[PDB]
């Protein structure tokens, strides 16, 4: 049969037919042998009422069938933590056992991963962007930015690898092109619409603790690492004068939306190296603050603006990069200049009186000291500013710290009310420990809860119940105290949805209202009924929960959360499974893998099974 | 559309029909298929040509669960990420090509020792006749209570006869192919002769202690066997129907037992 002969014999037998077909093609269609052969074969196949095979052939020719586009296989390989050798083994095994090439080779995957890395698509800027090169095909670079590693210089042993800020932003925009197009189509907008697109971006920076992989040989080195990443929060566009949010992130404080800029191995407390590494990024950011990006992603020129907000900084880093003292200062509020002593007296009445410019001014005053005053008065006049700030930060808090602080205060409140201290002026520590033990036993017997000094979120959540306060108040006489505790718990549960909703302007505006009223009522109850807790101690978390909540709400409008061991495990997995040696290409490879992992395109191709 | 292309290519259609009736005699299908394949291969797009040949000849799209289990074992893949990749590929390609963990575990427990029956002409004293048991405790019922000799080395083991018959069963195909190649039929009886070598050696440090550093130099050991010769004596002489190509390899070392004990 003809199907049993080799291609050579079939060619020798059908040379005349091929010549006739190609000459008809070049005489009628004008050198279109491919299309006419495709159509003739499709008609010959449909001549036997084979519509299933015809549809399968059309799907194969279109490429929407069993093709496994290199993007999909790249996402699979980068998500399942698959190395190159094992992936090639699987590919060749499947190709040999199936016959068809369902997966993709290695060079196709390399092209698919290079088409997504930063420094590929062209762009431009309306301002010249001084002190910034115009080259647009650069990717991973040394984070030291021309270090001074000579022997006669300050020694430093760090490996910093980074992307360029504008390149990373252009790559993220080219990645979310499809998402923003779909969003603007769903928002009832035209397919052709120029900018400017107001892009609000969140900034974050945090360490990774320990990333050492020493199996044995004792604790040789701690080897602390640190990263620096950003996250596009939202995109807005207007039609004339009315604005409309065209893109909003579903999970802002997640792991799959962490776009990394730089990765280095340096301690967070190491100030000089951190400053030397982060100065170029801060310079690029302050130069881009007032620029205009121009891109050609949607076939037409699109203009882009940017608004940066550094809210992803924890307390330990915001008390160091801002110039304030780390932990020994009397000043605790990162927004107000209230001392620890005045905070215990004034509870709610405060305001945000801190900014970057005023911090620079206070540091300049501290350095110059034109009044020639003593050290203590100068310190209390500069409000604890000792170091020069170089990063404009926007501090924020989460609900976890607020609730754990409230629960830690209420625990001691319960101890003080069960110990009958309002009639005993000076008690003993052993008597208070006996009170604590009795309360713990009573709680474990009635509510069946396990007490522990190590406090966390689950303990604070399970302790804040009406049944708990009822069970701990039914033991003490003078039901007036029971009514006081009832009012306190009621005010607490009324204030909880304000910071436990993530959107007070839409979820519960009535809960957001009367906030100052109930806060003043709580302060008056605490200062009159519980006129004993005034021992000169106050927690900064409790102060921020009392006073600086409405201001933060008016500034942003949400609280959210920050999942502690989230990035370190991923970094260790990337460094162990798919990474190179020599400690030079290791950081570049882990950064590239993390960038491919945090890509919205690959994640969208992955989670598409829910549909 | 269809009518337009038919009106434009009816001449080519009737021409190909006449040429096939003259040369092949009513075989336009094979002629057009071969022409399409030759065109696509001359276009230097052999991928689509091979895919079309496979989908036209009747090649199956998916694969057997055995191959999936094989690649999963040889790539060191977990279950969660394997299921993730499976569902992702099933959603992308639409059809089901891979196999879920159900049939995978089914084929796994089928291939494991202690599944197919067997027997022995001698009673095999001091050995039970049960034939549906696999992994068991290597302590062999050693009482390790408070009033006995202190011991805490966890040990697991197979049954020697069970692992032996499992190895024989998984090499049945190879030995049958060898017997067919060595001028022998299939309805042959034994007694086959199998040369089995045993080996065991320690491993050294197998504990990745990272809580505080080097805690204990935990050493492990494994006892294993290997089949490297299968012969049959027919008539006067014999013929080696199976000879291992490279027995000194880490791919045919069938393990019996594992212990966490020092050598
Ligand atoms: Mg931190
Ligand atoms: Mg040895
Ligand atoms: Zn404050």
Curated annotation (Swiss-Prot), chain B:
Changing residue 161 to A: Loss of DNA-binding. Changing residue 147 to A: Loss of DNA-binding. Autoubiquitinated in the presence of CDC34/UBCH3. GO terms for cellular component: nucleoplasm; nucleus. Changing residue 7 to A: Allows robust hairpin activity. Residues 1-57 bind DNA. GO terms for biological process: adaptive immune response; B cell differentiation; chromatin organization; DNA recombination; negative regulation of T cell apoptotic process; negative regulation of thymocyte apoptotic process; positive regulation of T cell differentiation; pre-B cell allelic exclusion. Disruption phenotype: Mice display a severe combined immunodeficiency phenotype. The have a small lymphoid organs that do not contain mature B and T-lymphocytes. The arrest of B- and T-cell differentiation occurs at an early stage and correlates with the inability to perform V(D)J recombination. The frequency of homologous immunoglobulin pairing is much lower. No obvious neuroanatomical or behavioral abnormalities have been observed. Coiled coil: none annotated. GO terms for molecular function: endonuclease activity; histone binding; identical protein binding; metal ion binding; protein homodimerization activity; sequence-specific DNA binding; ubiquitin protein ligase activity; ubiquitin-protein transferase activity. Maturing lymphoid cells and central nervous system. Changing residue 44 to A: Impairs DNA-binding. Its main location: nucleus. A divalent metal cation binds at residue 201. It is found in: Nucleus. Changing residue 201 to N: Loss of cleavage (both nicking and hairpin formation). Keywords: Chromatin regulator, DNA recombination, DNA-binding, Endonuclease, Hydrolase, Isopeptide bond, Metal-binding, Multifunctional enzyme, Nuclease, Nucleus, Transferase, Ubl conjugation, Ubl conjugation pathway, Zinc, Zinc-finger. Belongs to the RAG1 family. Catalytic component of the RAG complex, a multiprotein complex that mediates the DNA cleavage phase during V(D)J recombination. V(D)J recombination assembles a diverse repertoire of immunoglobulin and T-cell receptor genes in developing B and T-lymphocytes through rearrangement of different V (variable), in some cases D (diversity), and J (joining) gene segments. In the RAG complex, RAG1 mediates the DNA-binding to the conserved recombination signal sequences (RSS) and catalyzes the DNA cleavage activities by introducing a double-strand break between the RSS and the adjacent coding segment. Homodimer. Component of the RAG complex composed of core components RAG1 and RAG2, and associated component HMGB1 or HMGB2. Interacts with DCAF1, leading to recruitment of the CUL4A-RBX1-DDB1-DCAF1/VPRBP complex to ubiquitinate proteins and limit error-prone repair during V(D)J recombination. The RING-type zinc finger mediates the E3 ubiquitin-protein ligase activity. The NBD (nonamer binding) DNA-binding domain mediates the specific binding to the nonamer RSS motif by forming a tightly interwoven homodimer that binds and synapses 2 nonamer elements, with each NBD making contact with both DNA molecules. Each RSS is composed of well-conserved heptamer (consensus 5'-CACAGTG-3') and nonamer (consensus 5'-ACAAAAACC-3') sequences separated by a spacer of either 12 bp or 23 bp. This is V(D)J recombination-activating protein 1. The gene is Rag1. The chain holds residues 400 to 662 of 1040 of the full protein.
């Amino acid at each position: 049969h003809l199907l049993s002969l080799t291609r050579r014999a079939q060619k020798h037998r059908l040379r005349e037919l091929k010549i006739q077909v190609k000459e008809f093609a070049d005489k009628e269609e004008g050198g279109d042998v491919k299309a006419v052969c495709l159509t003739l074969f499709l008609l010959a196949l449909r001549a036997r009422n084979e519509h299933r095979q015809a549809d399968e052939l059309e799907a194969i020719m279109q490429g929407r069938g069993s093709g496994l586009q290199p993007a999909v296989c790249l996402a699979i390989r980068v998500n399942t933590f698959l190395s190159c050798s094992q992936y090639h083994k699987m590919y060749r095994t499947v190709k040999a056992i199936t016959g068809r090439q369902i997966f993709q080779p290695l060079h196709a995957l390399r092209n698919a991963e290079k088409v997504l890395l930063p420094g590929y698509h062209p762009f431009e800027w309306q301002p010249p962007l001084k002190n910034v090169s115009s080259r647009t095909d650069v990717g991973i670079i040394d984070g030291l930015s021309g270090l001074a590693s000579s022997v006669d210089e300050y020694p430093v042993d760090t490996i910093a690898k980074r992307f360029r800020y504008d390149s990373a932003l252009v790559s993220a925009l080219m990645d979310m092109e499809e998402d923003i197009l779909e969003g603007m189509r769903s928002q009832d907008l035209d397919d052709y619409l120029n900018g400017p697109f107001t892009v609000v971006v969140k900034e974050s920076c945090d360490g990774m603790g320990d990333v050492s992989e020493k199996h044995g040989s004792g604790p040789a080195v701690p080897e602390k690492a640190v990263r620096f990443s950003f996250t596009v929060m939202r995109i807005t566009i207007e039609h004339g004068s009315q604005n409309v949010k065209v893109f909003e992130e579903p999970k802002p404080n997640s792991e799959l939306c962490c776009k990394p800029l730089c990765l280095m191995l340096a301690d967070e407390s190491d100030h000089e190296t951190l400053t030397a590494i982060l100065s170029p990024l801060i310079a690029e950011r302050e130069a881009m603050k007032s620029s205009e990006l121009t891109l050609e992603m949607g076939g037409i020129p699109r203009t882009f603006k940017f608004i940066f907000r550094g809210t992803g900084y924890d307390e330990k880093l915001v008390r160091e990069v801002e110039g304030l003292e780390a932990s020994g200062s009397v000043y605790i509020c990162t927004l107000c200049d209230t001392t620890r002593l005045e905070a215990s007296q004034n509870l709610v009445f405060h305001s945000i009186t801190r900014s970057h410019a005023e911090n620079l001014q206070r540091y300049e005053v501290w350095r110059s000291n034109p009044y020639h005053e003593s050290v203590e008065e100068l310190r209390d006049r500069v409000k604890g500013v000792s170091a020069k700030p170089f990063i404009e930060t926007v501090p924020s808090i989460d609900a976890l710290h607020c609730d754990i602080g409230n629960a830690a205060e209420f625990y001691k409140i319960f101890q003080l009310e069960i110990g009958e201290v309002y009639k005993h002026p000076n008690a003993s520590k052993e008597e208070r420990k006996r009170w604590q033990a009795t309360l713990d036993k009573h709680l474990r017997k009635r509510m069946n809860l396990k007490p522990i000094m190590r406090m966390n979120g689950n303990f604070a959540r399970k302790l804040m119940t009406q049944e708990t306060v009822d069970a701990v108040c039914e033991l003490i006489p003078s039901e007036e105290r029971h009514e006081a505790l009832r009012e306190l718990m009621d005010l607490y549960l009324k204030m909880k949805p304000v910071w436990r909703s993530s959107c007070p302007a839409k979820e519960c505006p009535e809960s957001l209202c009367q906030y100052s009223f109930n806060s003043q009522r709580f302060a008056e109850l605490l200062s009159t009924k519980f006129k004993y807790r005034y021992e000169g101690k106050i927690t900064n978390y409790f102060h921020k929960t009392l006073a600086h909540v409405p201001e933060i709400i008016e500034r942003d409008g949400s609280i959210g959360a920050w999942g502690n061991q989230s990035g370190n495990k991923l970094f260790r997995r990337f460094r162990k499974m798919n990474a190179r040696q020599s400690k030079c290409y290791e950081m570049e490879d882990v950064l590239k893998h993390h960038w491919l992992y945090t890509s919205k395109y690959l994640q969208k191709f992955m989670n598409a099974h829910n549909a």
